[PDB]
Amino acid sequence: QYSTFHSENRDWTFNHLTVHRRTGAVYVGAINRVYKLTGNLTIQVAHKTGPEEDNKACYPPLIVQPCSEVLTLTNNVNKLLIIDYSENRLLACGSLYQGVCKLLRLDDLFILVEPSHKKEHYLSSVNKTGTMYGVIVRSEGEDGKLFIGTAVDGKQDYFPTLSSRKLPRDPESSAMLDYELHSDFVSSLIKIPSDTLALVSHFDIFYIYGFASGGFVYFLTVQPETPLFYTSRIVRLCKDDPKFHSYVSLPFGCTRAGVEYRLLQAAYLAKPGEALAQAFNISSDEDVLFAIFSKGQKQYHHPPDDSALCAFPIRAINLQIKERLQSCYHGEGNLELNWLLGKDVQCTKAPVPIDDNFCGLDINQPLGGSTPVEGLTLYTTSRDRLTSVASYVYNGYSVVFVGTKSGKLKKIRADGPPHGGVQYEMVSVFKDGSPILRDMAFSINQLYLYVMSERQVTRVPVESCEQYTTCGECLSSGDPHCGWCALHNMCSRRDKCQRAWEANRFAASISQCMSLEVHPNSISVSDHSRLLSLVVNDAPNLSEGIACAFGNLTEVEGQVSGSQVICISPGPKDVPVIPQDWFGLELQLRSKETGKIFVSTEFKFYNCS
Numbered sequence: 001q002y003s004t005f006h007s008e009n010r011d012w013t014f015n016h017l018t019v020h021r022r023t024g025a026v027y028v029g030a031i032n033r034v035y036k037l038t039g040n041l042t043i044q045v046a047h048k049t050g051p052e053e054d055n056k057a058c059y060p061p062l063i064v065q066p067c068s069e070v071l072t073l074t075n076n077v078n079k080l081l082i083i084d085y086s087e088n089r090l091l092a093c094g095s096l097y098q099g100v101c102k103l104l105r106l107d108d109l110f111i112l113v114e115p116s117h118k119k120e121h122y123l124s125s126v127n128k129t130g131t132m133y134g135v136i137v138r139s140e141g142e143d144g145k146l147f148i149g150t151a152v153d154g155k156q157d158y159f160p161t162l163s164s165r166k167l168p169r170d171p172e173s174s175a176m177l178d179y180e181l182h183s184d185f186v187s188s189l190i191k192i193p194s195d196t197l198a199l200v201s202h203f204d205i206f207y208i209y210g211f212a213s214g215g216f217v218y219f220l221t222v223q224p225e226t227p228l229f230y231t232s233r234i235v236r237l238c239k240d241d242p243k244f245h246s247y248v249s250l251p252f253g254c255t256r257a258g259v260e261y262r263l264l265q266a267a268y269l270a271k272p273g274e275a276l277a278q279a280f281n282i283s284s285d286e287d288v289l290f291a292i293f294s295k296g297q298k299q300y301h302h303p304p305d306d307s308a309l310c311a312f313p314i315r316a317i318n319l320q321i322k323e324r325l326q327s328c329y330h331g332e333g334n335l336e337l338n339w340l341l342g343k344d345v346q347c348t349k350a351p352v353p354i355d356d357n358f359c360g361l362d363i364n365q366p367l368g369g370s371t372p373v374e375g376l377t378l379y380t381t382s383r384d385r386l387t388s389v390a391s392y393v394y395n396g397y398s399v400v401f402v403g404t405k406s407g408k409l410k411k412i413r414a415d416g417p418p419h420g421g422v423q424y425e426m427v428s429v430f431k432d433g434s435p436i437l438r439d440m441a442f443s444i445n446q447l448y449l450y451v452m453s454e455r456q457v458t459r460v461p462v463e464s465c466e467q468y469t470t471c472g473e474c475l476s477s478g479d480p481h482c483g484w485c486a487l488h489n490m491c492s493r494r495d496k497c498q499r500a501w502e503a504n505r506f507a508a509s510i511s512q513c514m515s516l517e518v519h520p521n522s523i524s525v526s527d528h529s530r531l532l533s534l535v536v537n538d539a540p541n542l543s544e545g546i547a548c549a550f551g552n553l554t555e556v557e558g559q560v561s562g563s564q565v566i567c568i569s570p571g572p573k574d575v576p577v578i579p580q581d582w583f584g585l586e587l588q589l590r591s592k593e594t595g596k597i598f599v600s601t602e603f604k605f606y607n608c609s
């Protein structure tokens with residue numbers, strides 16, 4: 001019974017989702033709509049973005065200059081949704097009018113500005129989802145910039161495939177969304193060459209994901225392989241490089257057991273957790289890129305189910321790039337980036353020191369490479385295709401959530417070789433079997449993960465430990481969230497277990513589970529009302545009081561001293577009725593501190609007659 005929000009319309013489908021880290025406001029980008037919802041997915045405001053009359057042939061767009069073309073009522077696909085944290089704004093870009101963007105207030109989604117007066121304010125007319133990504137970069141003191149990667153719809157001269165645009169703090173800035181750098185010969189953008197479009201029909205580059213880490217930004221792309229096959233790549237730029245000389249692009253993927261997964265589907269940047277940090281030999285607070293790959297390099301449009309979850313430490317990505325740079329600056333081989341260069345170009349040997357933070361020169365760039373960056377494969381399936389990924393760290397454990405094509409959400413505990421991570425739970429989110437989309441986001445305290453299909457957004461609890469009804473089940477579940485709350489007789493998070501910090505109140509390994517011993521273990525029916533001496537192993541304080549329940553029969557107050565409890569057998573009018581020569585029962589202790597029955601052990605009655 002998860003909180004959920006449905007699309008208002010079978011055709012106004014959901015595209016993107018983001019959650020404000022501080023307010024917990026949920027923003028959903030959808031066709032013709034941007035929604036602001038509460039934590040439990042109740043609408044507080046909905047901004048309408050379409051439909052509107054339009055035509056892709058109107059360039060510049062209708063909103064800028066008159067157009068003679070026949071117009072058609074057109075749906076506005078949300079292509080970009082990013083929170084501009086320092087400025088309390090939401091960036092929302094659609095497919096209408098050659099892809100202008102809006103800046104919206106976070107509180108009421110009211111429009112701040114909609115840049116439309118320059119040609120670079122038109123991001124792209126592509127109206128398919130999952131082909132564009134952006135990353136905002138702004139340090140304290142800096143005005144701000146926005147890196148955008150996008151498919152260009154074969155309009156290579158209208159729209160850069162990747163570029164940097166100004167994103168000033170002042171919404172009214174006369175420079176809003178201009179190119180960071182524009183010169184006759186040098187600008188802060190990459191254009192797809194006509195040559196490449198000529199070589200490959202409907203060639204385009206799809207931007208699956210993007211993130212900032214350290215001094216760089218990273219974009220993850222899929223595109224047709226220039227002489228079908230696709231290549232998934234990591235693209236890196238220095239954060240401060242208006243000339244784009246730092247451009248480096250390397251293929252990536254992963255393998256396991258003769259199977260190659262080289263077709264990128266989804267990705268998410270997070271911390272490693274202790275196991276992965278060890279495996280990668282990095283520090284706990286260093287970044288790791290988690291990714292979903294489909295089998296092979298073919299069939300981009302119709303992937304098989306065979307897919308994998310893979311992890312790439314940012315450190316290894318940077319290292320392999322630095323070494324590529326050093327090899328190239330030593331004069332070895334060529335730049336190897338045919339799609340962008342249009343020919344083989346030799347690496348230039350030059351007396352230039354390359355450090356971790358090398359930001360390029362006008363030689364040896366843009367830089368490519370044929371050797372893939374290999375990730376650590378964590379999990380594979382051949383059954384239900386993996387479609388999404390999010391991850392965080394709980395108590396030093398990496399918990400990776402992976403959505404599927406049939407609306408399942410897998411919960412995977414990560415560790416390195418041998419053969420980790422491990423799926424400890426799978427949950428059905430969408431009963432109609434709809435694919436889970438790429439965008440997932442956590443609530444403010446990582447209590448929930450918000451997950452979306454085309455027609456639904458659902459708030460999914462990160463854990464449901466209480467589904468485990470014994471200490472044994474609880475602590476053998478594999479779920480890093482779950483421990484056994486001793487006195488409340490329940491499986492929960494440490495933080496959900498009152499006085500968990502007190503001795504033996506919270507069990508974190510199957511070993512700490514309480515056991516009960518009775519002395520003696522059995523009595524004769526003719527021996528009613530006898531004093532039994534009980535011992536509770538691994539007990540917390542019981543001095544608050546203990547009652548003794550002999551099954552459904554009686555319940556008496558017990559005598560407490562440390563972890564020992566004295567209780568009196570039931571009287572003659574309560575001694576059970578033997579079938580057999582013996583009648584079994586369950587002697588249970590009740591905590592007066594909590595009111596809950598929390599342990600029991602078998603107790604026997606007999607009749608030697």
Ligand SMILES: *[C@@H]1O[C@H](CO)[C@@H](O)[C@H](O)[C@H]1NC(C)=O
Pocket residue numbers: 038040041042
């Ligand atoms: C969700 O939040 C709203 C606040 O507007 C509240 O009225 C509603 O009861 C909540 N829904 C739940 C948790 O059932």
Ligand SMILES: *[C@@H]1O[C@H](CO)[C@@H](O)[C@H](O)[C@H]1NC(C)=O
Pocket residue numbers: 074075077127128
């Ligand atoms: C999206 O744009 C394409 C242009 O190639 C068009 O053919 C298609 O009908 C559009 N789909 C909509 C209206 O969402």
Ligand SMILES: *[C@@H]1O[C@H](CO)[C@@H](O)[C@H](O)[C@H]1NC(C)=O
Pocket residue numbers: 281
């Ligand atoms: C792991 O890192 C440490 C320093 O951080 C280094 O000494 C060691 O060589 C590395 N482990 C390997 C590669 O065996």
Ligand SMILES: *[C@@H]1O[C@H](CO)[C@@H](O)[C@H](O)[C@H]1NC(C)=O
Pocket residue numbers: 552553
């Ligand atoms: C014991 O009592 C329980 C409910 O307290 C009842 O369901 C059960 O039938 C009883 N067992 C007997 C009478 O043996």
